Every structure is written in C-alpha cells, then in structure tokens.
C-alpha cells in the first residue's frame, strides 16, 4: 500500500521516471480505472450509508476484491 505499483503485475521496488512508473508491467481496469482492493489508510469513505466500501463488498460474499486477490500471475 506504500508504492505506486499497487494491485498491478510488476515489482514493489519502483521509481518515478518520464515514461511513467518503472515497476509496472501489466494491470487490469474496469471503466478505465485500476481494479484494486479497498485497503490502506484512504478507504474510510462510507458513501450514501455508514458502511465503508471494503465491508460493503464482504457482505456480498465477494473475495475477488481486486487483481491482487484473485491470485492472478
């Protein structure tokens, strides 16, 4: 959660360069947005109701919260 290459195929080791991020090789997106699990420090938004998006998914029985959680290699 402390690196720009999160929930993407690549390396945790990374650098910021002109062409983009050096540790990124492949990623998957829905509606042109990174498919990532709601984890870290910035996942406290509850939306319309008082339930955060992370527990909101869990109540629906979903374990495929993002690309990193499907075990994709």
């Amino acid at each position: 959660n402390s690196k720009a290459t999160d929930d993407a195929v690549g390396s945790a080791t990374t650098q910021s360069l002109s062409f983009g991020e050096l540790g990124r090789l492949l990623d998957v997106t829905f509606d042109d947005v990174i498919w990532s699990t709601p984890d870290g420090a910035n996942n406290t938004a509850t939306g319309n109701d008082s339930d955060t998006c992370s527990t909101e998914l869990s109540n629906a029985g979903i374990t495929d919260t993002g690309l990193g959680a499907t075990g994709f290699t």
Binding site: S18, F19, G20, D32
Partner: protein
C-alpha cells in the same frame, strides 16, 4: 539548417472518447538517425471553451489522465 514545423491530424471531426492520431513534422528533432528520439508532450497546447492545458504532466490537474496518451 533549421526548418519550421507542420502539425496535422488524421481527420478534422472527432467523436468524444475516440482516438485521434496527432502528427508533428519537425526535422529539427532527428538529432540521431540510428535511434528513434522521444520528446515531451507538454510542447502541444490544448485551448478550448472547457480549459487551456498542455496535454502533459504540466497541464491542469487530471488533464494527463483525461487524454490517455499512447505512448506517453
């Protein structure tokens, strides 16, 4: 020698969200023949009723992601 640049596109009218091919003819920039040279995208200006921006990392906030350049 130095020459003046020619800037052009594949077609005049575009549907919103479609991909446009943008072409720049600057002979000033072929410094090495053996390699393909790369130049920053901030050189181009986008000015319209919506906003005025450089279409690169130096544009208005979220403009870079709004164009999704391929390549960068």
């Amino acid at each position: 020698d130095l020459r003046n640049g020619v800037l052009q596109s594949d077609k005049s009218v575009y549907i919103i969200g479609s991909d446009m091919i943008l072409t720049l003819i600057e002979p000033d920039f072929d410094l090495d023949n053996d390699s393909a040279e790369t130049y920053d995208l901030d050189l181009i200006e986008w000015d319209s009723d919506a906003a005025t921006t450089t279409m690169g990392n130096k544009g208005v906030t979220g403009a870079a992601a709004a164009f999704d350049p391929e390549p960068t």
